[PDB]
Amino acid sequence: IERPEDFLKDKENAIQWEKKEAERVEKNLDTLEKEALELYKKDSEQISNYSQTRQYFYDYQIESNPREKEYKNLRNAISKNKIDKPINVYYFESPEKFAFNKEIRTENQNEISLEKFNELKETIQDKLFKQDGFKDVSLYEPGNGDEKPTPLLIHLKLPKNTGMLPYINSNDVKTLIEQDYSIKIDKIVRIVIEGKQYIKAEASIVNSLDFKDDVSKGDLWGKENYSDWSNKLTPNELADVNDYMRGGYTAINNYLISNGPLNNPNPELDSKVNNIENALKLTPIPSNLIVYRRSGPQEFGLTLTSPEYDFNKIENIDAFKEKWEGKVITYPNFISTSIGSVNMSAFAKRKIILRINIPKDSPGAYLSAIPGYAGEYEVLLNHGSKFKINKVDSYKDGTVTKLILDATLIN
Amino acid sequence: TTALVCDNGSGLVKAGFAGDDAPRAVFPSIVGRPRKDSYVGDEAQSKRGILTLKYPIEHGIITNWDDMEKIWHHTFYNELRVAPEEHPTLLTEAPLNPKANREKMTQIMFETFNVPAMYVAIQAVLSLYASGRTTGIVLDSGDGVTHNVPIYEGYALPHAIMRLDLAGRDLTDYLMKILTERGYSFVTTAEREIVRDIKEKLCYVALDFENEMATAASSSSLEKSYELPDGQVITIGNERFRCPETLFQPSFIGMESAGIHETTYNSIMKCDIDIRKDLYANNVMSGGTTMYPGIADRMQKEITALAPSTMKIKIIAPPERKYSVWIGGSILASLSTFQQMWITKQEYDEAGPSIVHRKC
Numbered sequence: 001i002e003r004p005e006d007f008l009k010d011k012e013n014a015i016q017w018e019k020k021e022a023e024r025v026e027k028n029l030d031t032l033e034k035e036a037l038e039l040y041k042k043d044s045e046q047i048s049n050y051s052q053t054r055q056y057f058y059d060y061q062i063e064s065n066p067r068e069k070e071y072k073n074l075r076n077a078i079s080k081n082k083i084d085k086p087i088n089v090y091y092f093e094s095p096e097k098f099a100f101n102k103e104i105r106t107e108n109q110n111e112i113s114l115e116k117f118n119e120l121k122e123t124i125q126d127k128l129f130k131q132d133g134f135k136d137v138s139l140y141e142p143g144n145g146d147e148k149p150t151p152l153l154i155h156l157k158l159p160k161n162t163g164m165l166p167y168i169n170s171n172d173v174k175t176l177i178e179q180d181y182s183i184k185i186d187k188i189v190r191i192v193i194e195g196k197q198y199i200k201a202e203a204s205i206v207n208s209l210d211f212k213d214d215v216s217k218g219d220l221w222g223k224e225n226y227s228d229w230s231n232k233l234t235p236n237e238l239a240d241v242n243d244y245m246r247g248g249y250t251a252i253n254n255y256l257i258s259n260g261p262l263n264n265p266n267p268e269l270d271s272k273v274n275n276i277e278n279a280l281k282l283t284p285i286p287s288n289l290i291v292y293r294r295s296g297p298q299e300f301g302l303t304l305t306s307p308e309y310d311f312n313k314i315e316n317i318d319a320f321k322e323k324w325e326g327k328v329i330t331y332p333n334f335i336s337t338s339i340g341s342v343n344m345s346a347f348a349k350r351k352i353i354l355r356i357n358i359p360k361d362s363p364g365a366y367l368s369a370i371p372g373y374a375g376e377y378e379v380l381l382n383h384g385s386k387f388k389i390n391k392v393d394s395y396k397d398g399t400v401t402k403l404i405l406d407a408t409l410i411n
Numbered sequence: 412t413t414a415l416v417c418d419n420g421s422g423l424v425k426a427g428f429a430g431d432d433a434p435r436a437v438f439p440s441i442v443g444r445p446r447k448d449s450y451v452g453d454e455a456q457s458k459r460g461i462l463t464l465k466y467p468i469e470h471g472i473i474t475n476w477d478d479m480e481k482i483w484h485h486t487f488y489n490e491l492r493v494a495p496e497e498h499p500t501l502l503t504e505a506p507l508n509p510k511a512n513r514e515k516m517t518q519i520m521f522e523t524f525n526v527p528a529m530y531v532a533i534q535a536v537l538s539l540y541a542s543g544r545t546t547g548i549v550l551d552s553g554d555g556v557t558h559n560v561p562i563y564e565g566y567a568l569p570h571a572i573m574r575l576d577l578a579g580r581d582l583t584d585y586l587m588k589i590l591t592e593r594g595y596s597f598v599t600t601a602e603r604e605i606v607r608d609i610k611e612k613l614c615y616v617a618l619d620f621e622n623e624m625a626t627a628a629s630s631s632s633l634e635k636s637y638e639l640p641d642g643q644v645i646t647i648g649n650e651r652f653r654c655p656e657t658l659f660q661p662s663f664i665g666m667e668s669a670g671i672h673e674t675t676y677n678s679i680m681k682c683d684i685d686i687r688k689d690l691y692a693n694n695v696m697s698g699g700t701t702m703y704p705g706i707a708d709r710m711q712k713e714i715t716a717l718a719p720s721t722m723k724i725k726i727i728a729p730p731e732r733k734y735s736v737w738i739g740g741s742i743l744a745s746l747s748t749f750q751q752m753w754i755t756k757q758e759y760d761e762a763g764p765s766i767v768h769r770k771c
């Protein structure tokens with residue numbers, strides 16, 4: 001009479017409990033939401049693709065996208081029902097999704113070799129991968145006669161209070177979530193179903209504040225946490241940060257990028273970097289936080305003019321992926337970032353978006369707490385930060401293919 | 412009884428008397444980085460080193476307060492030959508100038524220069540005002556920064572202001588680079604001044620860039636020639652429109668921001684839909700860098716291409732465009748209904764630097 005946290009293989013009890021839940025939750029949807037759902041079932045693939053990619057445009061392009069009304073209303077439908085205890089869910093991924101850019105086995109082979117398994121473990125095991133968008137999940141491990149489109153099965157623990165919409169699609173019970181978080185894969189085991197080998201990955205949610213296009217909500221949080229930060233500095237620190245902010249950034253960052261501190265030491269500058277840095281530890285980032293930086297090519301050893309930078313050609317994505325996926329880039333300069341994901345005039349044309357996950361307690365500040373600052377909803381991160389590039393995604397902005405880099409700050 | 416108007420630009424100071432049609436002094440907004448001690452403005456067109464050229468305003472914002480004081484000092488004593496104590500003073504500021512910053516200005520004006528009264532106006536609002544307007548969108552493009560500033564009923568809409576750190580100074584550097592690419596060598600700071608002149612003298616904005624490239628390649632019709640101080644005369648070809656093409660394609664210069672047509676559009680689009688028609692009809696250009704022949708026509712074409720096809724689009728490029736900020740200040744400082752707007756020594760003594768926010 002209570003559902004377990006994990007229906008495991010018990011398909012019959014899964015359906016039975018979920019059909020009941022579907023009839024209950026369905027009662028609580030308003031008109032907008034039922035409509036959104038009826039819309040989703042007829043167009044799930046296009047609607048999900050939009051929910052992955054929507055924040056990356058200019059606000060005015062967001063506000064007027066015809067797909068946007070359906071996104072907001074489907075979003076609201078999912079979050080009407082919030083689980084009272086954790087539930088495990090099951091779904092197939094393509095291995096591309098975790099930057100394993102090669103088949104695990106073919107669609108015809110039944111065994112997954114000792115090598116591939118092991119290679120797969122090195123690729124996916126030690127990272128937080130960002131998930132985003134509407135996803136269909138199942139409440140039981142599939143068995144005989146359920147679709148099994150990949151060698152990769154995800155077994156994910158959704159925490160208490162995760163939004164989950166169970167619903168009848170004519171004959172079946174289906175389960176809809178909006179992924180709004182990151183995943184860690186704690187283990188991978190092999191498993192057999194209907195004669196073939198599969199990989200089951202045990203995954204858990206790591207949560208992060210991500211305001212995406214909601215720059216206002218993002219600002220509230222920034223000012224709520226950072227408007228007393230200015231008063232926490234020493235006289236010296238205040239002045240050296242005011243200097244950075246008001247225009248000193250180009251000389252400090254230029255000095256760092258050539259590794260002046262070692263190659264040609266400048267003691268005024270060094271002291272300035274020392275103070276800014278110390279200042280960035282006065283209010284450590286109080287919560288796990290996703291930030292967005294739109295990047296120049298120079299940041300990835302490239303120029304506006306490099307033919308490797310035309311991402312309209314798969315080769316170049318594939319080559320950028322080789323160079324960077326799985327790698328870690330170090331930033332010698334102070335890195336300025338925004339809690340907003342939107343496109344902005346100052347960088348309209350930039351083609352690489354570094355989407356960064358900042359662990360709670362990392363050095364950083366919401367510089368934009370200080371009025372008049374030209375940076376937009378800006379968080380500044382410390383010089384010498386390293387970023388693990390777990391995954392490279394791509395999207396169309398007009399005719400221009402740009403890149404999203406799932407990254408993690410590792411100190 | 413006669414107000415001073417002083418327009419503080421990234422590269423040029425425009426200064427003079429309210430009620431006049433043109434400023435009386437315009438001079439370089441530079442001082443000195445020493446080894447008698449430091450020469451200020453057009454006088455540092457002398458020892459520019461090893462007592463070297465420093466710029467106290469960068470990208471429209473004051474950042475070196477000490478050299479700023481010296482600029483102001485020079486303005487009053489060396490240039491305008493007046494006593495600051497004797498004249499209410501209107502100063503201009505960049506769009507989105509921080510409060511902190513507006514207050515430092517006030518404090519210094521009152522305490523260091525002992526002005527009887529003062530006011531700070533937004534530079535773009537005054538340009539609009541110079542051409543009889545109170546609603547409109549201004550492209551202000553100077554030496555160190557360019558802005559798109561939508562304004563409704565005398566109010567700038569700070570959330571829709573676009574800022575590009577791309578302007579005349581970068582355009583001269585780029586003319587230097589490309590002229591060097593042709594086999595000349597323009598690299599020193601002295602040479603930087605000659606290319607400024609070449610830029611102001613011979614550059615223009617092609618109505619159709621790719622077409623102008625084709626004309627220049629296949630015939631000779633577009634070449635002009637120029638005499639250097641040493642009497643050498645050089646030829647200049649497609650550099651003539653390539654240079655200010657950077658304003659539309661910042662990528663010419665490695666920059667990845669939107670161009671001035673796109674920031675214009677963006678700016679308009681961040682404004683609420685009932686006022687947009689008003690903005691499209693009332694696109695005002697101002698600043699030395701909007702002086703290129705062809706630019707108004709080119710802007711007309713680009714904005715037409717982005718806007719809905721039922722939109723009335725008017726570009727206003729006054730011939731006085733390069734002093735229109737100053738002029739707007741002259742008109743304001745004489746406007747009679749403007750006189751209650753001044754901040755007196757008395758009100759400053761009472762309310763402090765903060766009074767400078769009145770609501771206009």
Ligand SMILES: Nc1ncnc2c1ncn2[C@@H]1O[C@H](COP(=O)(O)OP(=O)(O)OP(=O)(O)O)[C@@H](O)[C@H]1O
Nearest residue numbers: 420421422423553554555556579611698699700702
């Ligand atoms: N005819 C012209 N053609 C092109 N550029 C010009 C012309 N006349 C002046 N300029 C450029 O205008 C710039 C100065 O204009 P302006 O005084 O409007 O700028 P500013 O107020 O000093 O600086 P800013 O507005 O960036 O703070 C210089 O780069 C100058 O080369």
Ligand SMILES: C/C1=C/C(=O)O[C@@H]2C[C@@H](CC[C@H](C)/C=C/C=C/CC1)O[C@@](O)([C@@H]1CSC(=O)N1)C2
Nearest residue numbers: 422423439440441456554579580583603604607
């Ligand atoms: C009539 C006039 C115009 C002018 O030069 O505007 C300004 C003034 C100038 C100050 C420094 C140099 C030495 C010039 C001193 C005297 C200049 C003559 C003043 O800095 C600019 O040259 C910069 C550099 S090159 C450019 O494109 N912007 C723009």
Ligand SMILES: [Ca+2]
Nearest residue numbers: 419420421553
């Ligand atoms: Ca100016």
